[PDB]
Amino acid sequence: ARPCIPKSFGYSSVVCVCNATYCDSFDPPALGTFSRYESTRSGRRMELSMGPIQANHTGTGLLLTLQPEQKFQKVKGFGGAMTDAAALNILALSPPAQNLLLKSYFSEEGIGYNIIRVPMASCDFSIRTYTYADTPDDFQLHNFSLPEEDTKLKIPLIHRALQLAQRPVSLLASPWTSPTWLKTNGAVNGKGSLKGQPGDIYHQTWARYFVKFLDAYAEHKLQFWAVTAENEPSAGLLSGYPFQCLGFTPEHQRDFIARDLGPTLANSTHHNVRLLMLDDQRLLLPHWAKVVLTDPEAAKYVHGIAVHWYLDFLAPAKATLGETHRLFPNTMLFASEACVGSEQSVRLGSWDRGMQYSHSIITNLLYHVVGWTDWNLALNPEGGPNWVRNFVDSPIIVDITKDTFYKQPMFYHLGHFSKFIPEGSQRVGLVASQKNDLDAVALMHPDGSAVVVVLNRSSKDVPLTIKDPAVGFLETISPGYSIHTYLWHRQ
Amino acid sequence: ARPCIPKSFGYSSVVCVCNATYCDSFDPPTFPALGTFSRYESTRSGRRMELSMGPIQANHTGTGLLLTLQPEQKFQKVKGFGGAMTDAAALNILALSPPAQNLLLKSYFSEEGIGYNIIRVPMASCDFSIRTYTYADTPDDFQLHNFSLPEEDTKLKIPLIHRALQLAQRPVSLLASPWTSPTWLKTNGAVNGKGSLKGQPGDIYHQTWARYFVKFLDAYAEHKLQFWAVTAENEPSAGLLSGYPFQCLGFTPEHQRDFIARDLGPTLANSTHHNVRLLMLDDQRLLLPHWAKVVLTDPEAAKYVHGIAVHWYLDFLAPAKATLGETHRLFPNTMLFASEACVSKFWEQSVRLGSWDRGMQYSHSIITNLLYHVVGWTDWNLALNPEGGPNWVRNFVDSPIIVDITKDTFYKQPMFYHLGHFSKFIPEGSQRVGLVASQKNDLDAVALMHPDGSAVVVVLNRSSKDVPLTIKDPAVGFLETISPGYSIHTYLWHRQ
Ligand SMILES: *[C@@H]1O[C@H](CO)[C@@H](O[C@@H]2O[C@H](CO)[C@@H](O)[C@H](O)[C@H]2NC(C)=O)[C@H](O)[C@H]1NC(C)=O
Ligand SMILES: *[C@@H]1O[C@H](CO)[C@@H](O[C@@H]2O[C@H](CO)[C@@H](O)[C@H](O)[C@H]2NC(C)=O)[C@H](O)[C@H]1NC(C)=O
Ligand SMILES: *[C@@H]1O[C@H](CO)[C@@H](O)[C@H](O)[C@H]1NC(C)=O
């Protein structure tokens, strides 16, 4: 319906400028033809074109063959995090600009997000340290309450996101810190774990804190798909950890889930809510999964393993995600947090940072991961606000003085997956005819249709063909530093 | 022997204070009779290589962890231990008064210090420089008629290297690594950023770069300095990254393979410096074993590669077994060497004076290296100022010695003593041997045998709890000891 209005900030590519009255959007083929969406460094943003599916092919050029019978994981979804910082920045825009921001992420005319991660009280992307139960030694949680950050910022924006979304949206909840009076160190940050031992008053109180949070969100007519056991439990084992954390060893996590959180959640009105373990760097795999899941008192309560990554780094996937799947094939892997920046926090129009997102989503999908969740939905041009100045990049940058927001390349690299891979999509095989500089992945929608995403991280154009046995050959080019999503009918 | 004079700066342990007239030192070590051992102890509480002796007895009183020497299980031979004579380290050492300079160099290189026998020497400028020179900055000089050493070499590095070799009883091995070529050999025409050599292996750019290594070896030879080895390029992967902030030169594994086969190997072999070894990679271990597969499976490259150099910085991204272990399995006659064994959590300063944690990180990494076939370690900067400098970009790292120019003093960090628990007591030619733990335990430990057959065992306790310990030598008996919380021990004994 409306195209990108580009702006340069002097980096490798352009942002798309939106305001109170204008934002780029889509308005949404027949058997024998394919659809192709293209985004390029040079400035194209999800441009739609169609080609013919050709019955024959000849050449010594690169070929990718769909293996429609080699089935892997089914996709849960894509989304990002409604942090205090994200909600603050969105609600500082004028109401119509807010509506266009939420539409970009959550409407069929935008990129189809069906995941929202919600912090349980404060994190580094907050303007203060609070928990829901700051009255010291309140073991019965009689002073448990949602502050304005939930009731005036996060909850209303979540309601507006679900209203714009036609797809059902899944809410994921993760705590950073407990109340300080439940912690060995009496602080929201630093090295510190729950007081006492699993099964005791501290552990049972913390488990009930999860049920109170779910009760309070339900009073506001929101229901959760899943909670994590703790955000980055490894962090609160580190002396001087600068922001909100709660330390667990894998053994403590195991014992906490087995003795306290599993049973407490199971006996509650919120028993359908799933529990995810780890919620931390994938380098902790497979050891953390072995400790927790080889104990059936804990394993009967764990639905999945949540993984984090910092996209400037490259670590092996098979050794971590691969081995974990092999040991625990019925325990879904789910990517719950990723980001880039700290090099400058915000790099408006950075094409490299877009390639980091799509490269990471393809790696993840090739090694059994069912979903992929961005960090902050929106930040300011500084990459905040953040009470410890731990500034990072975000796919959407809000410029409050201009009532303007910028959609970065990261937004479009995300969208090339989230818009075209609905919940239920199943990854299928795709074999390269020769070594190549392309990342690619193929999935089939519930209805039967095909989606393939191709990223070229080289500067060279790569001619290639995609073979699907049931229809023929898709003849195409991958321009250097391009990302394409291909769609086609099969029956 | 003069003891440590301790000073606290508010961190977990103390530094040892040295100045123009006083530095802590040892007597020459002295092996007791069969039936007796020597133990050197350093603790977070403040002990700094304190010597005691005790019995190895035929009766086993201990009921806890037993570590059994297995001298017939033989692994790698050690090349040695050292650090880097960067521009920053030379400037820091030389801003002390001469007598203080001599005590700093003795700390590292004398038999009364910690017996370093390797120095890494940058080929012109790096981040630990106060400017961005190469040895051939005049462009279009393909025969390098204008190659020359600046002040940094002729006035700072070379005299300090001469003085280190004069202090050491041990023969010292020199290792050289370039960061960038002259910018007129580069695709990007800059010292940093995304930039490889112009053109392709075999061509005049690649021949000129290979000739630069010989010109460098020739120039140091004129100053009566010879090299054990050079690396093919410092962190070749850096130069493939957009915006890489300091001196680099990009090679893919394939370009490194072809540069070695066509240019660097043949040029070194056809020179008077043909005895100098060549190490490949000089980069993060997460790049193994792939980098080794690409280079070493081409016989025209492999004939010229003596070893694989690895850097510690991003060790947290890939485990030792999958990288060092797999590389040894696939290429068991190509030695592994740690060429840049350095540190800093984003929320901490570059320099923490008296950090026990940073010391434990060094000894923990040396033990893991030794258990995965590594033969040698070069630390980074030999000395830095209290800001972690000078560095023309950014101070991300600490150093075992911190120089306070304004007080003519220097500070020996915990790192210095954690290194020394190895470097002092494991001479060149020492061989790692078996050491079997009787049960699961929290200690890190390694056993080696000296050339003369005497035993050395290092035990690190990164836990807060004291651990009762017996060590068994089948030829001698039982050593009853304790590994105190936050301690490191080196044990030495004759076996006959
Ligand atoms: C919001 O952005 C839109 C699109 O860039 C602006 O609409 C443009 O207005 C300019 C005036 O300089 C015209 O040149 C264009 O013809 C308009 N384009 C479209 C598609 O309408 C709008 O002016 C911006 N709003 C504010 C308040 O600055
Ligand atoms: C270097 O430090 C040493 C030891 O810290 C100094 O020696 C001490 O000096 C005081 C006088 O201020 C004497 O009372 C002590 O007996 C000395 N200690 C020892 C162990 O000798 C030394 O003077 C300093 N050198 C310089 C040149 O300042
Ligand atoms: C805790 O709850 C009591 C009443 O149940 C209330 O009067 C008091 O103000 C509360 N404390 C805080 C800090 O809100």
Short mmCIF file of C-alpha atoms in Angstrom, two decimals, chain A residues 60-459:
data_model
loop_
_atom_site.label_atom_id
_atom_site.label_comp_id
_atom_site.label_asym_id
_atom_site.label_seq_id
_atom_site.Cartn_x
_atom_site.Cartn_y
_atom_site.Cartn_z
CA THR A 60 26.70 -25.89 -13.70
CA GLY A 61 25.15 -23.08 -11.52
CA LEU A 62 24.17 -23.34 -7.80
CA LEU A 63 20.99 -25.42 -7.18
CA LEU A 64 18.99 -25.76 -3.90
CA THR A 65 16.67 -28.81 -3.84
CA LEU A 66 13.63 -28.92 -1.53
CA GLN A 67 13.30 -32.29 0.32
CA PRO A 68 9.59 -31.96 1.20
CA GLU A 69 9.59 -35.42 2.94
CA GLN A 70 12.53 -34.55 5.33
CA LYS A 71 10.38 -32.92 8.12
CA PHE A 72 12.01 -31.12 11.18
CA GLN A 73 10.55 -28.75 13.91
CA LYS A 74 7.17 -26.91 13.83
CA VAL A 75 7.46 -23.11 14.37
CA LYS A 76 6.00 -21.42 17.50
CA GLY A 77 6.62 -17.80 16.28
CA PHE A 78 8.53 -14.49 16.21
CA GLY A 79 8.34 -11.37 18.36
CA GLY A 80 10.12 -9.04 20.78
CA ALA A 81 10.08 -7.65 24.34
CA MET A 82 7.69 -5.08 25.85
CA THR A 83 10.33 -3.65 28.32
CA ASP A 84 9.63 -0.49 30.44
CA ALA A 85 11.99 1.32 27.98
CA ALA A 86 10.13 0.09 24.87
CA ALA A 87 6.67 0.99 26.32
CA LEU A 88 7.90 4.45 27.53
CA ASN A 89 9.34 5.36 24.05
CA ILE A 90 6.20 4.13 22.13
CA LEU A 91 3.79 6.06 24.44
CA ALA A 92 5.90 9.30 24.10
CA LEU A 93 4.80 9.42 20.37
CA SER A 94 1.40 11.00 19.51
CA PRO A 95 -1.48 8.49 19.48
CA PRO A 96 -1.65 8.09 15.65
CA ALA A 97 2.18 7.50 15.41
CA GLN A 98 1.78 4.91 18.28
CA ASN A 99 -0.92 3.10 16.20
CA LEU A 100 1.42 3.01 13.10
CA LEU A 101 4.33 1.66 15.25
CA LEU A 102 2.15 -1.18 16.71
CA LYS A 103 0.76 -1.97 13.19
CA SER A 104 4.33 -2.27 11.77
CA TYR A 105 4.96 -5.17 14.23
CA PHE A 106 1.51 -6.73 14.96
CA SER A 107 -0.88 -6.31 11.93
CA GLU A 108 -1.10 -8.50 8.77
CA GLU A 109 -0.21 -5.17 7.00
CA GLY A 110 3.07 -5.21 9.08
CA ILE A 111 5.40 -8.17 9.88
CA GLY A 112 3.02 -10.49 11.77
CA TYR A 113 4.67 -10.74 15.28
CA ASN A 114 2.92 -13.46 17.39
CA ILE A 115 5.31 -13.44 20.47
CA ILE A 116 5.66 -10.75 23.23
CA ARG A 117 8.19 -11.28 26.07
CA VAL A 118 7.15 -9.40 29.27
CA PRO A 119 9.63 -8.73 32.13
CA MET A 120 8.25 -9.56 35.63
CA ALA A 121 9.13 -6.14 37.17
CA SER A 122 12.32 -4.19 36.47
CA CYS A 123 15.42 -4.99 34.34
CA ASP A 124 18.32 -2.85 32.95
CA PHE A 125 15.84 -1.41 30.31
CA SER A 126 13.90 0.31 33.18
CA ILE A 127 14.21 3.82 34.75
CA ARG A 128 14.24 2.42 38.33
CA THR A 129 14.73 -0.84 40.30
CA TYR A 130 11.41 -2.10 41.68
CA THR A 131 9.97 -5.60 42.23
CA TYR A 132 6.25 -6.42 42.80
CA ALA A 133 6.94 -7.18 46.54
CA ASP A 134 9.45 -4.65 48.00
CA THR A 135 7.97 -4.69 51.62
CA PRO A 136 10.77 -6.55 53.55
CA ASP A 137 9.99 -10.12 54.76
CA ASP A 138 6.44 -10.09 53.19
CA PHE A 139 6.39 -13.97 52.91
CA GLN A 140 2.53 -14.03 52.41
CA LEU A 141 2.94 -11.38 49.59
CA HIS A 142 0.11 -9.19 51.10
CA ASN A 143 1.90 -6.10 49.54
CA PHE A 144 2.28 -7.69 46.03
CA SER A 145 1.16 -5.08 43.42
CA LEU A 146 1.68 -4.04 39.76
CA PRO A 147 3.09 -0.49 39.52
CA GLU A 148 2.27 2.06 36.75
CA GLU A 149 5.01 0.52 34.51
CA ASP A 150 2.62 -2.51 34.13
CA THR A 151 -0.85 -0.88 34.55
CA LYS A 152 -0.26 2.35 32.47
CA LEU A 153 2.59 1.41 29.97
CA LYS A 154 3.01 -2.40 29.33
CA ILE A 155 -0.55 -3.80 29.76
CA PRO A 156 -2.35 -1.18 27.54
CA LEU A 157 0.25 -1.57 24.74
CA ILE A 158 -0.08 -5.41 24.94
CA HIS A 159 -3.95 -5.09 24.64
CA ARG A 160 -3.51 -2.79 21.58
CA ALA A 161 -0.96 -5.27 20.04
CA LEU A 162 -3.38 -8.27 20.43
CA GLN A 163 -6.27 -6.17 18.92
CA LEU A 164 -4.15 -5.31 15.82
CA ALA A 165 -2.96 -8.95 15.47
CA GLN A 166 -5.33 -11.37 13.61
CA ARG A 167 -2.97 -14.28 14.59
CA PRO A 168 -3.23 -15.42 18.24
CA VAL A 169 -0.26 -13.84 20.19
CA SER A 170 1.73 -15.81 22.84
CA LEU A 171 2.95 -13.91 25.96
CA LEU A 172 6.28 -15.14 27.53
CA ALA A 173 7.21 -13.84 31.10
CA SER A 174 10.77 -13.74 32.58
CA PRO A 175 11.97 -12.30 35.95
CA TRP A 176 15.45 -10.69 36.36
CA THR A 177 15.44 -10.28 40.22
CA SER A 178 13.37 -11.39 43.21
CA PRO A 179 12.64 -9.05 46.09
CA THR A 180 15.99 -8.31 47.87
CA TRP A 181 14.76 -9.96 51.15
CA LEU A 182 14.59 -13.39 49.31
CA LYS A 183 18.34 -13.00 48.26
CA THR A 184 21.64 -13.89 50.06
CA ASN A 185 23.13 -10.43 49.12
CA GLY A 186 20.19 -8.08 49.92
CA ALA A 187 20.50 -6.30 46.49
CA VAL A 188 18.68 -6.40 43.06
CA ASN A 189 22.15 -6.82 41.40
CA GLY A 190 25.57 -8.38 42.31
CA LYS A 191 26.43 -12.05 43.09
CA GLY A 192 23.43 -13.53 44.94
CA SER A 193 20.98 -16.49 44.94
CA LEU A 194 17.73 -17.32 46.79
CA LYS A 195 18.31 -17.74 50.59
CA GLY A 196 18.03 -21.22 52.14
CA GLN A 197 17.40 -24.46 50.23
CA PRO A 198 14.84 -25.66 47.67
CA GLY A 199 11.53 -26.56 49.40
CA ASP A 200 11.95 -23.86 52.15
CA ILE A 201 9.99 -20.58 52.86
CA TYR A 202 12.15 -18.37 50.53
CA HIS A 203 11.78 -20.84 47.59
CA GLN A 204 8.01 -21.38 48.17
CA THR A 205 7.46 -17.54 48.44
CA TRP A 206 9.35 -16.94 45.15
CA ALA A 207 7.31 -19.70 43.44
CA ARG A 208 4.05 -18.09 44.71
CA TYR A 209 5.36 -14.70 43.35
CA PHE A 210 5.03 -16.23 39.81
CA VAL A 211 1.34 -17.19 40.55
CA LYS A 212 0.58 -13.65 41.96
CA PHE A 213 2.09 -12.11 38.74
CA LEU A 214 -0.11 -14.40 36.57
CA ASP A 215 -3.17 -13.65 38.81
CA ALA A 216 -2.59 -9.86 38.43
CA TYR A 217 -2.14 -9.97 34.59
CA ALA A 218 -5.33 -12.20 34.41
CA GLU A 219 -7.30 -9.53 36.41
CA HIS A 220 -6.26 -7.32 33.38
CA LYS A 221 -7.55 -10.06 30.92
CA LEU A 222 -4.08 -11.22 29.72
CA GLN A 223 -3.08 -14.93 29.79
CA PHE A 224 0.50 -16.28 29.36
CA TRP A 225 1.69 -19.08 27.04
CA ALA A 226 4.92 -19.65 29.07
CA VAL A 227 7.21 -18.29 31.85
CA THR A 228 11.01 -18.74 32.09
CA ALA A 229 12.49 -20.12 35.38
CA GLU A 230 14.78 -17.01 35.55
CA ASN A 231 16.38 -14.55 33.05
CA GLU A 232 20.15 -15.38 32.67
CA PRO A 233 20.54 -17.41 35.95
CA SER A 234 24.35 -17.64 35.26
CA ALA A 235 24.58 -13.79 35.67
CA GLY A 236 23.83 -13.73 39.45
CA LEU A 237 26.83 -16.11 40.06
CA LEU A 238 29.15 -13.24 38.87
CA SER A 239 30.58 -10.76 41.45
CA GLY A 240 29.72 -7.11 40.55
CA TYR A 241 26.99 -8.10 38.00
CA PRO A 242 25.78 -4.53 37.33
CA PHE A 243 21.96 -4.96 36.93
CA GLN A 244 18.99 -7.03 38.12
CA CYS A 245 19.85 -10.77 38.41
CA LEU A 246 19.12 -13.93 40.53
CA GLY A 247 21.86 -16.59 40.58
CA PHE A 248 21.19 -20.30 39.99
CA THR A 249 23.54 -23.19 39.29
CA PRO A 250 21.92 -25.86 37.09
CA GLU A 251 21.52 -28.00 40.29
CA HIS A 252 19.64 -25.11 42.10
CA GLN A 253 17.46 -24.55 38.95
CA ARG A 254 16.74 -28.34 38.89
CA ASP A 255 15.90 -28.42 42.63
CA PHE A 256 13.89 -25.12 42.48
CA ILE A 257 11.74 -26.44 39.55
CA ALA A 258 11.26 -29.92 41.16
CA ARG A 259 10.51 -28.79 44.79
CA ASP A 260 8.84 -25.32 44.33
CA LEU A 261 7.95 -23.79 40.90
CA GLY A 262 6.56 -26.90 39.08
CA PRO A 263 4.22 -28.01 41.91
CA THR A 264 3.17 -24.40 42.76
CA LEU A 265 2.26 -23.73 39.06
CA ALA A 266 0.55 -27.20 38.72
CA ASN A 267 -1.76 -26.60 41.81
CA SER A 268 -2.66 -23.03 40.58
CA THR A 269 -5.56 -21.90 38.28
CA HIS A 270 -2.68 -21.10 35.80
CA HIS A 271 -1.60 -24.81 35.36
CA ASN A 272 -1.85 -24.65 31.49
CA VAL A 273 1.03 -22.03 31.43
CA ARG A 274 4.24 -23.78 30.16
CA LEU A 275 7.62 -23.55 31.92
CA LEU A 276 10.91 -22.95 29.97
CA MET A 277 14.32 -23.61 31.64
CA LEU A 278 17.81 -21.97 31.10
CA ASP A 279 16.85 -18.60 29.38
CA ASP A 280 20.61 -17.99 28.94
CA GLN A 281 23.62 -18.25 26.52
CA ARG A 282 23.52 -21.51 24.47
CA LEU A 283 27.22 -22.16 25.46
CA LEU A 284 25.73 -23.54 28.76
CA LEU A 285 24.22 -26.39 26.61
CA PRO A 286 24.14 -29.30 26.73
CA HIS A 287 25.38 -29.49 30.41
CA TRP A 288 22.43 -27.41 31.83
CA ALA A 289 19.78 -29.57 30.01
CA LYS A 290 21.51 -32.83 31.25
CA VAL A 291 21.54 -31.63 34.92
CA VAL A 292 17.82 -30.57 34.90
CA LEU A 293 16.10 -33.01 32.50
CA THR A 294 17.86 -36.32 33.56
CA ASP A 295 15.86 -35.81 36.85
CA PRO A 296 12.20 -36.81 36.25
CA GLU A 297 10.90 -34.79 39.30
CA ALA A 298 12.09 -31.63 37.33
CA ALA A 299 11.60 -32.90 33.70
CA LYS A 300 7.84 -33.49 34.13
CA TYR A 301 7.51 -29.67 34.71
CA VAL A 302 9.80 -28.41 31.84
CA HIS A 303 8.13 -27.84 28.37
CA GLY A 304 11.22 -26.33 26.64
CA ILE A 305 14.75 -24.78 26.80
CA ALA A 306 15.08 -20.98 26.20
CA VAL A 307 18.40 -19.77 24.66
CA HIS A 308 19.99 -16.30 24.32
CA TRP A 309 22.71 -15.02 21.94
CA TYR A 310 24.69 -11.77 21.42
CA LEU A 311 24.89 -11.41 17.61
CA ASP A 312 28.45 -9.84 17.34
CA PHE A 313 29.75 -13.38 18.36
CA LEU A 314 29.85 -16.71 16.38
CA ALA A 315 29.89 -20.01 18.42
CA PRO A 316 29.19 -23.57 17.10
CA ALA A 317 25.46 -24.57 16.94
CA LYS A 318 25.60 -28.41 16.47
CA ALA A 319 27.69 -28.92 19.70
CA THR A 320 25.09 -26.92 21.75
CA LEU A 321 21.60 -26.78 20.10
CA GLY A 322 22.28 -30.01 18.08
CA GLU A 323 23.49 -32.26 20.95
CA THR A 324 20.68 -30.93 23.21
CA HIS A 325 18.00 -31.92 20.59
CA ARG A 326 19.63 -35.37 20.23
CA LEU A 327 19.55 -35.98 24.07
CA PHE A 328 16.05 -34.38 24.61
CA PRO A 329 14.21 -34.47 21.24
CA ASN A 330 10.73 -33.94 22.87
CA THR A 331 11.87 -30.73 24.69
CA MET A 332 11.52 -27.76 22.26
CA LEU A 333 14.42 -25.25 21.84
CA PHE A 334 13.19 -21.58 21.78
CA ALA A 335 15.30 -18.39 21.27
CA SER A 336 14.03 -15.89 23.91
CA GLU A 337 16.51 -12.95 23.63
CA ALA A 338 19.00 -11.58 21.02
CA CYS A 339 20.51 -8.12 20.25
CA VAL A 340 23.57 -6.22 18.80
CA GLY A 341 25.43 -2.99 19.95
CA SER A 342 26.82 -1.82 23.38
CA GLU A 343 31.17 -0.06 18.73
CA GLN A 344 28.23 2.44 19.11
CA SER A 345 24.87 1.38 20.67
CA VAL A 346 22.57 2.62 17.82
CA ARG A 347 23.82 2.69 14.19
CA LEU A 348 20.85 4.09 12.23
CA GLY A 349 20.54 2.24 8.87
CA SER A 350 23.25 -0.45 9.61
CA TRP A 351 22.93 -3.25 6.98
CA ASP A 352 25.49 -5.49 8.83
CA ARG A 353 23.23 -5.45 11.92
CA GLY A 354 20.30 -6.62 9.76
CA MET A 355 22.45 -9.49 8.36
CA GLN A 356 23.38 -10.45 11.96
CA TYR A 357 19.61 -10.89 12.75
CA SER A 358 18.73 -13.03 9.65
CA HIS A 359 21.99 -15.07 9.82
CA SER A 360 21.13 -15.85 13.51
CA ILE A 361 17.46 -16.79 12.69
CA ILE A 362 18.67 -19.19 9.92
CA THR A 363 21.37 -20.80 12.13
CA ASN A 364 18.70 -21.28 14.85
CA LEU A 365 16.05 -22.77 12.43
CA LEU A 366 18.70 -25.18 10.94
CA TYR A 367 19.33 -26.54 14.52
CA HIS A 368 15.78 -27.29 15.77
CA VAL A 369 14.84 -23.86 17.31
CA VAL A 370 11.00 -23.33 17.12
CA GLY A 371 10.84 -19.51 17.81
CA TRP A 372 13.04 -16.34 17.86
CA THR A 373 12.46 -13.33 20.17
CA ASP A 374 14.16 -9.93 19.79
CA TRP A 375 14.97 -7.79 22.84
CA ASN A 376 13.47 -4.21 23.14
CA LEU A 377 10.62 -3.53 20.58
CA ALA A 378 11.77 0.17 20.47
CA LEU A 379 14.57 2.38 21.91
CA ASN A 380 15.58 6.10 21.63
CA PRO A 381 18.58 7.18 19.46
CA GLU A 382 20.90 6.68 22.50
CA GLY A 383 19.67 3.04 22.80
CA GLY A 384 17.77 3.68 26.05
CA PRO A 385 16.50 4.55 28.45
CA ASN A 386 18.59 2.16 30.66
CA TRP A 387 19.28 2.86 34.41
CA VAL A 388 22.88 1.41 34.15
CA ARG A 389 23.53 2.96 30.67
CA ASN A 390 23.73 -0.63 29.18
CA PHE A 391 22.57 0.84 25.79
CA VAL A 392 21.94 -1.46 22.73
CA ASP A 393 20.34 -1.28 19.20
CA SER A 394 16.62 -1.97 18.42
CA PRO A 395 14.77 -2.59 15.08
CA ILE A 396 12.68 0.61 15.75
CA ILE A 397 14.22 3.91 16.99
CA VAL A 398 11.76 6.56 18.40
CA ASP A 399 12.61 10.28 17.89
CA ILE A 400 10.22 11.92 20.44
CA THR A 401 11.18 15.56 19.44
CA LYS A 402 10.10 14.81 15.81
CA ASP A 403 7.11 12.55 16.65
CA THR A 404 8.98 10.19 14.21
CA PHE A 405 10.17 6.52 14.27
CA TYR A 406 12.87 4.82 12.12
CA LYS A 407 12.50 1.18 10.91
CA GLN A 408 16.11 -0.16 10.69
CA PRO A 409 17.37 -2.94 8.39
CA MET A 410 17.02 -5.30 11.45
CA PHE A 411 13.17 -4.73 11.30
CA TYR A 412 13.13 -5.90 7.60
CA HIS A 413 15.55 -8.89 8.10
CA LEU A 414 13.25 -10.01 10.99
CA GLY A 415 10.14 -9.39 8.85
CA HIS A 416 11.41 -11.62 5.95
CA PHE A 417 10.85 -14.51 8.49
CA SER A 418 8.01 -13.29 10.80
CA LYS A 419 5.67 -12.07 7.99
CA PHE A 420 5.93 -15.35 5.93
CA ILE A 421 6.36 -18.19 8.55
CA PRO A 422 3.07 -18.51 10.49
CA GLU A 423 2.73 -20.63 13.69
CA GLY A 424 2.65 -24.36 12.64
CA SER A 425 5.04 -23.93 9.65
CA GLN A 426 7.41 -26.96 9.53
CA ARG A 427 11.06 -26.75 8.45
CA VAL A 428 11.89 -29.23 5.62
CA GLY A 429 15.19 -30.21 3.95
CA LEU A 430 17.01 -28.06 1.37
CA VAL A 431 20.31 -29.41 -0.11
CA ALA A 432 22.90 -27.24 -1.94
CA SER A 433 24.33 -28.74 -5.22
CA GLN A 434 27.76 -27.15 -4.31
CA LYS A 435 29.65 -25.07 -1.63
CA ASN A 436 28.33 -21.44 -1.57
CA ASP A 437 28.26 -18.16 0.51
CA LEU A 438 24.42 -18.22 0.95
CA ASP A 439 22.43 -19.00 4.11
CA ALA A 440 19.06 -20.55 3.25
CA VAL A 441 16.19 -22.40 4.93
CA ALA A 442 12.91 -23.93 3.65
CA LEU A 443 9.60 -24.50 5.51
CA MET A 444 6.06 -25.59 4.54
CA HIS A 445 2.98 -23.67 5.85
CA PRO A 446 0.16 -25.62 7.56
CA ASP A 447 -1.88 -25.34 4.27
CA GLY A 448 0.91 -27.09 2.20
CA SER A 449 2.62 -24.04 0.52
CA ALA A 450 6.42 -23.43 0.43
CA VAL A 451 8.56 -20.60 1.93
CA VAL A 452 12.37 -20.27 1.40
CA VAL A 453 14.56 -17.41 2.79
CA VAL A 454 18.03 -16.74 1.23
CA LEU A 455 20.59 -14.28 2.68
CA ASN A 456 23.76 -13.42 0.63
CA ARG A 457 26.44 -12.19 3.11
CA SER A 458 28.95 -11.70 0.19
CA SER A 459 29.25 -8.62 -2.13
#
